[PDB]
Design an enzyme around this catalytic site. Structure first.
Site, mmCIF file in Angstrom:
data_model
loop_
_atom_site.group_PDB
_atom_site.id
_atom_site.type_symbol
_atom_site.label_atom_id
_atom_site.label_comp_id
_atom_site.label_asym_id
_atom_site.label_seq_id
_atom_site.Cartn_x
_atom_site.Cartn_y
_atom_site.Cartn_z
ATOM 1 N N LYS A 1 3.571 -14.311 9.430
ATOM 2 C CA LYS A 1 3.378 -12.853 9.477
ATOM 3 C C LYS A 1 1.865 -12.618 9.508
ATOM 4 C CE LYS A 1 5.278 -11.413 5.704
ATOM 5 N NZ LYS A 1 6.707 -11.773 5.678
ATOM 6 N N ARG A 2 1.443 -11.414 9.880
ATOM 7 C CA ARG A 2 0.008 -11.112 9.895
ATOM 8 C C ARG A 2 -0.613 -11.369 8.513
ATOM 9 N NH1 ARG A 2 -2.273 -8.353 14.501
ATOM 10 N NH2 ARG A 2 -4.146 -8.420 13.169
ATOM 11 N N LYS B 1 0.640 -8.836 1.655
ATOM 12 C CA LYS B 1 1.695 -9.800 1.974
ATOM 13 C C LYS B 1 1.584 -11.066 1.107
ATOM 14 C CE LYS B 1 2.048 -8.089 6.815
ATOM 15 N NZ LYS B 1 3.550 -7.847 6.935
HETATM 16 O O1 25E Z 1 8.951 -0.819 10.848
HETATM 17 C C1 25E Z 1 8.394 -2.005 11.448
HETATM 18 C C2 25E Z 1 7.328 -2.659 10.559
HETATM 19 O O2 25E Z 1 6.149 -1.853 10.588
HETATM 20 C C3 25E Z 1 5.036 -2.460 9.904
HETATM 21 N N1 25E Z 1 3.902 -1.585 10.154
HETATM 22 C C4 25E Z 1 2.908 -1.921 10.990
HETATM 23 S S1 25E Z 1 2.876 -3.445 11.776
HETATM 24 N N2 25E Z 1 1.947 -1.006 11.165
HETATM 25 N N3 25E Z 1 2.052 0.087 10.548
HETATM 26 C C5 25E Z 1 1.222 1.034 10.622
HETATM 27 C C6 25E Z 1 -0.029 1.040 11.441
HETATM 28 C C7 25E Z 1 -0.305 0.038 12.383
HETATM 29 C C8 25E Z 1 -1.484 0.077 13.129
HETATM 30 C C9 25E Z 1 -2.390 1.123 12.936
HETATM 31 O O3 25E Z 1 -3.541 1.172 13.662
HETATM 32 C C10 25E Z 1 -2.125 2.126 12.000
HETATM 33 C C11 25E Z 1 -0.943 2.083 11.260
HETATM 34 C C12 25E Z 1 5.329 -2.524 8.404
HETATM 35 O O4 25E Z 1 4.201 -3.066 7.687
HETATM 36 C C13 25E Z 1 6.587 -3.389 8.216
HETATM 37 O O5 25E Z 1 6.975 -3.437 6.833
HETATM 38 C C14 25E Z 1 7.755 -2.902 9.094
HETATM 39 O O6 25E Z 1 8.791 -3.881 9.069
#
Ligand code: 25E
Ligand code: 25E
Ligand code: 25E
Ligand code: 25E
Lengths: 810, 810
Positions: free
Chosen positions: A542-543, A548
């Site tokens: 995962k990232r 995390k």
């Molecule tokens: O629902 C799908 C997934 O979404 C991810 N969110 C992610 S990867 N980004 N979320 C917000 C974000 C991403 C990039 C931005 O530049 C700003 C907000 C969540 O961290 C996960 O828990 C979830 O499973």
């Protein structure tokens, strides 16, 4: 060869062979003497893509005649991965192509490895979009994915001296056979300019124009002949652009930079002008396309009956004021009616509660870039706040908390507040996450409009995430319960009645062993690293993020190492501990974590006393194609985020489906996974959300844990003293400092329970039969986490459309 | 429909139709209900391109087995035009495709108009390269054209208020169906860095790398199944380029700018760093390719027996020191042997005597960009000057005149001197031009090495320039003498015996009338302009230059206008005077000339007294596709450069072949055209080269002509006083000033003879029968000016290879 991969009929095999040779000759301009593996990959890609055409044309024809309600899924990310095998799976062509290539003297698997991932996303949010498209097609919905065609996707990660280096992901270099350019549907997008007020309406004038050129990629449903469209916009300068001469032509690059590169931030907001431009670019082009299609079916009252727009996070939130702009300024509807249409059209999905991940655009940026949109946003805010004032009279603090405009040093627009205001539905992505939204960050909004708030627990497509990447598992399942589970994953429950079946137990375990041997061979070939395939495969992929808690995994690893060095001649269950993931280029702590992981490996993997009992491997360049390989080989899935921080997770579901047991906190979808499988069939540890809140009130004191746990103290002293960095003894001081004094995610508070729970994992692994029976109970209850279920719920509960499993005519 | 366009056989027509529908469906992803004319064009392009494949593969196979000497034609320009019709002509598919499209309900001519020109050149030099490729294929030579794939070719010209505006020629926007990308033959090109001296050799280190990605375009011979390759390099950044993160990815543009745009200078040198980079880029990538192919056949003594490199002007002159660099630094040959190989490999073609058009690169540029090449150039110069010193002892002035290094404020390298030194042959492009080279600008070099100097009079391909653009003329010729003249243009001489044949006279004149009606209709449709098709079509089309004396044409036009206004009720032969051509964006005087032409039209075309007796039209956006239309419609070809200035001209030959009579000076190839046709069959006027020299010694005094010619004085007074610019009376003062005080090209000195000669044109036109008989004598003697003759002479006299007319197996 195997049943689930379709028929290899004599006519089909003969037909594939000849179309393959035709493409090699006419398309690639090669003969068999000069062709490379890449040419062979491309001939196959073209041969396969030919089978999408008729269905793609007839599906879009069908939507034109039937005029169903259309679903528009707007996302800045679509993490698609490779397309060749997925296309074969969904068209039932896999065995026929395998046979056709075999007879031409080619290994199809080797050809599959040549395809670059379409890496148009960062992680979970981008992969969710991709899984959704697959489920939407499989469920016969008239759905379109709209995004950006980035020239450069997520960077390729190289590890150099233990450090992450980034290189440009030049994924289009050899050409993308899966897309069709549609320059004829090119549309203008406007930027900058100024607002002029006339007798009848505002007008946006003196704008700079950038062209949006669409590229269409087909999305095939699973064996239903439905083929939907993903439309991705590329930025093009108009031809009179800047038009001394040489420079004017070269400056066209400035316009075209909009689609150049994906922002590599997972769960972090960077307020950069280029990013804003990308957000408007996708939104402006998409809405024009939507409205065009709607008119070619004046009565905008029917717009919401014919259109649904889903906002994947706040990234396309400008859809709301852009729709208002078009309806008010161009179509001349009155504000209140335009607003009614907008709300009923739009829905918003939130993917995070981390404050630093929320988009808050500086007012001065919107002022220069999108002057009319700012005016529209101010007007939305005034009218929304008037409703709040009327519902909660005299509650002045509620007014500033709920305002779309945040006051301070720099004024900002809260895009999440915008989204809630302009949407008829707002959902979180797992039950606990959605509850956290109602109870904390959006509490005020839930109190004003409780009807708007929903849950839609995430899922993954069982096509890519079982059939494609784990054919051996898919086949041993199909032998017992048939093939119908592939598009109805609840059927896996039938496997519960095989938990004591000796043949099935043996087969489940054999498939895992085969997957582990294959991955262990993969590691030696492409990366020259030795692993013991008998060991427990302990994987965290995962990232890289502090939330995390890859660092908690690191501490466990060091604990195991220290215990071995303490009692070298004692038996321990052997483990291969694999950690992988990309860090955002600007994220210093994440880059330090990667270096820690590799530095730990350097010590552990060369200690003669350890032997093959503990191995620590950093999995380089983690991406969709790598997930498809490592997930089927995993025994233990590490899902160890601090409770309250992982909105859902989807990696977790991928591991559950592929026969790994889960060690995890009660966070995100883990809670629902444990509930489905039974808590006795999950390795749950650590603080719950409520325990975290209790500690926060009291104050988190890391020193307390350091003082009371001698095993933890030793690790900190090793890190500090330079045990893991002998040449640069102070290398990890930032990490120690953070853990000791500035840890937002309370790594120490979960350490004891984590280590203890890990001992219980090792104990179970010593008993192969009982390990496998628990595995069976996980796979058997993973049905809920199909994105077909997720999408069916969006369809019925948000979009107002019925899913269909019926075949379109072939 | 017509004989020369090939057979329309039942099997071929059926086969084209089905492949057309297959491409429309599988390639374009359309059906007949949604397809636009552009889709139909693309389906046809793909259907046609399919017929090149087998021949292209077998031709290149053939060269590999036979290992003939290879010809490499290096040019920064290839002005190709459109490819669809040319491909059909050379494959004998034209009538079959015409019939296939007709039965599908399509007009092939309308589809042909959809294709953009490949405008990868400025004018004559670029078009010469293209004609050469066609002749090289038609003559069965193992030839490769190497150049740059510019993203933007020569700009599209729009006329706005009489002024030239430029717009980017975004010719790749819809994709180029005629090319095949070859990313697998991608090669590195090095820039900047420094020179390190070791024990065994110099070494070029710390360089910036740019990747050269080849794109191959097939060049079909005329009906001989030979298909050669034009390989054009595109610039690509390497993937670790600059590798904060976002900016590093965006900065890749800097590297890729090398192939972005064609420099729009015809006959002018601009010492810009980007241009230098383009010159090295094509040279470095090409030579690596050449050497690779040579090795895959150590014994570099055989290099010149297997390789010829032709330098199209000095633009690829860096080939000489680059070959030396590779042979000395990398292959470790001794200097003298490397030099021997180089000289025997390279040949240089000069295309101009204008001092401002000669490339003289500042030393400081080469020092930074190509430090090793400068060192090599210095060494070449030292050794060359030692030979000069030995041949002409004590002639110190000869030494500085012949030096490759020019001294002054800024030190420069004379690229022409480099080319002469490092080549075994140097040619001019028409007999008088080649003589001018030996007598004046390269006199010193001719005295040192007379054997090096040659003539190769230019030509044009009769495939594009007769059969393709004038099928009606080609057909009436073929009816009498067969079709063999198309690849043996000397056969047109047989037409002399038809000069008194009444049927042929009628047919020649009918074809011209039909071409004029077609072009007159073309003008109304796409440009809403009215012309009299009975008038004499007086055309001057070519790049706008002072030396080409569009201004002398302008003065004639005004003279005619003034004479009509003087005696309105007198009969004059009606004329449509058409002038067209692009001006280089920085060239102010050329832009003023365009404005003068349109300003003259504005006055002449709206004067009620003039009527349809005189029309002046500026032909907008002159380019290859427009030449193909206007040249067949022309009656009078204006070739009126000051004697000594047009090296050859090729436009002149195009008009001669298509039934226009020529008014021209004894300049460039005009001299040889007049000699072939007979001087009584040409409208020759003006100073010869010797008369120009006489006037130069004496001193050119424009005032003398102004004082002694009252008709000329009136025109100058009209220009000065604002007759042609009533609102801006001083608009043309720069032009008057130049004519009166600063005219390098002596417009006034040829005025009287020009006007007089033009009266003789009008007199002949009054006698349709005698006009046409003179036309026949021109067409009948235009055989010499086939590029098949030109290329046969290069082959035998420079490259050491025999042409072949034999068919390769189909
Ligand atoms: O629902 C799908 C997934 O979404 C991810 N969110 C992610 S990867 N980004 N979320 C917000 C974000 C991403 C990039 C931005 O530049 C700003 C907000 C969540 O961290 C996960 O828990 C979830 O499973
Ligand atoms: O081959 C590389 C090129 O392919 C072209 N595609 C064309 S011309 N037709 N594509 C048809 C098609 C695409 C996807 C399908 O699933 C089926 C057909 C694309 O438009 C280009 O962007 C790409 O570079
Ligand atoms: O269709 C548009 C694309 O076509 C591709 N060509 C391909 S995949 N095959 N081309 C084969 C070919 C080309 C020229 C011929 O004369 C015959 C075959 C080119 O490589 C691309 O650069 C171009 O954009
Ligand atoms: O031989 C083909 C033709 O070449 C042209 N020369 C041209 S178009 N350019 N010549 C030199 C040049 C061009 C661009 C430069 O940047 C520098 C020099 C000559 O002017 C013509 O007379 C001749 O017919």
């Amino acid at each position: 060869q195997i049943s689930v991969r379709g028929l290899a009929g004599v006519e089909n095999v003969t037909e594939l062979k000849k179309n393959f040779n035709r493409h090699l000759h006419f398309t690639l301009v090669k003969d068999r003497n000069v062709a490379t593996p890449r040419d062979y990959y491309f001939a196959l890609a073209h041969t396969v893509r030919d089978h999408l055409v008729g269905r793609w044309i007839r599906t879009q024809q069908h939507y034109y005649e039937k005029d169903p309600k259309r679903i528009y899924y707007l996302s800045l990310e679509f993490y698609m991965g490779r397309t060749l095998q997925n296309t074969m799976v969904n068209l039932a062509l896999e065995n026929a192509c395998d046979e056709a290539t075999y007879q031409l003297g080619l290994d199809m698997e080797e050809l599959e490895e040549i395809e670059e991932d379409a890496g148009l996303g960062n992680g979970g949010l981008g992969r969710l979009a991709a899984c959704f498209l697959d489920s939407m097609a499989t469920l016969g919905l008239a759905a379109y994915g709209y995004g950006i065609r980035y020239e450069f996707g997520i960077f390729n990660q190289k590890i150099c001296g233990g450090w992450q280096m980034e290189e440009a992901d030049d994924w289009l270099r050899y050409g993308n056979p899966w897309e069709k350019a549609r320059p004829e549907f090119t549309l203008p997008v406007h930027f900058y300019g100024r607002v002029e007020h006339t007798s009848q309406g505002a007008k946006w004038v003196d704008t700079q124009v950038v062209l949006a050129m669409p590229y269409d990629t087909p999305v095939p449903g699973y064996r239903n002949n439905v083929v939907n469209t993903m439309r991705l916009w590329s930025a093009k300068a108009p031809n009179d652009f800047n038009l001394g001469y040489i420079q004017a032509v070269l400056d066209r690059n400035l316009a075209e930079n909009i689609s150049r590169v994906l922002y590599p931030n997972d769960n972090f907001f960077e307020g950069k002008e280029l990013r804003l431009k990308q957000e408007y670019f996708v939104v402006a082009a998409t809405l024009q396309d939507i409205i065009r299609r709607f008119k070619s079916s004046t009565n905008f009252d029917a717009f919401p009956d014919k259109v649904a727009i889903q906002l994947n996070d706040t990234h396309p939130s400008l859809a709301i004021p852009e729709l208002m702009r078009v309806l008010v300024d161009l179509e001349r509807l009155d504000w209140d009616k335009a607003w009614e249409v907008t709300v009923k059209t739009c829905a918003y999905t939130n993917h995070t509660v981390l404050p630093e991940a929320l988009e808050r655009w500086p007012v001065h940026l919107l002022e220069t870039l999108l002057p009319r949109h700012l005016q529209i946003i101010y007007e939305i805010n005034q009218r929304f706040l008037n409703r709040v004032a009327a519902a909660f009279p005299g509650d002045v603090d509620r007014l500033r908390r709920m305002s779309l405009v945040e006051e301070g040093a720099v004024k900002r627009i809260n895009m999440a507040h915008l989204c809630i205001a302009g949407s008829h539905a707002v959902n979180g992505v797992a039950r606990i996450h959605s509850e956290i939204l109602k109870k904390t960050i959006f509490k005020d909004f839930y109190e004003l409009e409780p009807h708007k708030f929903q849950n839609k627990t995430n899922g993954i497509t069982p096509r890519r995430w079982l059939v494609l990447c784990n054919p051996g598992l898919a086949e041993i399942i199909a032998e017992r319960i048939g093939e119908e589970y592939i598009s109805d994953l609840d059927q896996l429950r039938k496997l519960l009645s095989y938990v004591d079946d000796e043949a099935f137990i043996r087969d489940v375990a054999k498939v895992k062993q085969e997957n582990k041997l294959k991955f262990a061979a993969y590691l030696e070939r492409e990366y020259k690293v030795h692993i013991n395939p008998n060991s427990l495969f302990d994987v965290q992929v995962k990232r890289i993020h502090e939330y995390k808690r890859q660092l908690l995994n690191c501490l466990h690893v060091i604990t195991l190492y220290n215990r071995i060095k303490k009692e070298p001649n004692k038996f321990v269950v052997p483990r291969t501990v694999m950690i992988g993931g990309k860090a955002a280029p600007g994220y210093h702590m994440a880059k330090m974590i990667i270096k820690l992981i590799t530095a730990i490996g350097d010590v552990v993997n060369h200690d003669p006393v350890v032997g093959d009992r503990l191995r620590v491997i950093f999995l380089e360049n983690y991406r969709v194609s790598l997930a498809e390989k490592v997930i089927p080989a995993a025994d233990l899935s590490e899902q160890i985020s601090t409770a309250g921080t992982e909105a859902s997770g989807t990696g977790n579901m991928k591991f559950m489906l592929n026969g790994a047991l889960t060690i995890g906190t009660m966070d995100g979808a883990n809670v629902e996974m444990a509930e489905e499988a039974g808590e006795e069939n999950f390795f749950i540890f650590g603080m719950r959300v409520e325990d975290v809140d209790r500690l926060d009130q009291r104050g988190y004191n890391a020193q307390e844990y350091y003082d009371r746990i001698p095993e933890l103290r030793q690790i900190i002293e090793q890190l500090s003293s330079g045990f893991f960095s002998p040449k640069q003894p102070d290398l990890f001081k930032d990490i120690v400092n953070m853990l000791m004094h500035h840890d937002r995610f309370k790594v120490f508070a979960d350490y004891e329970e984590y280590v203890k729970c890990q001992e219980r994992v090792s104990a179970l692994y010593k008993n192969p039969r009982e390990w496998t029976r628990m595995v069976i109970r996980n796979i058997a209850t993973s049905g809920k986490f199909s994105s077909d279920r997720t999408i069916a719920q969006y369809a019925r509960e948000i979009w107002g459309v019925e899913p269909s499993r019926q075949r379109l005519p072939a």
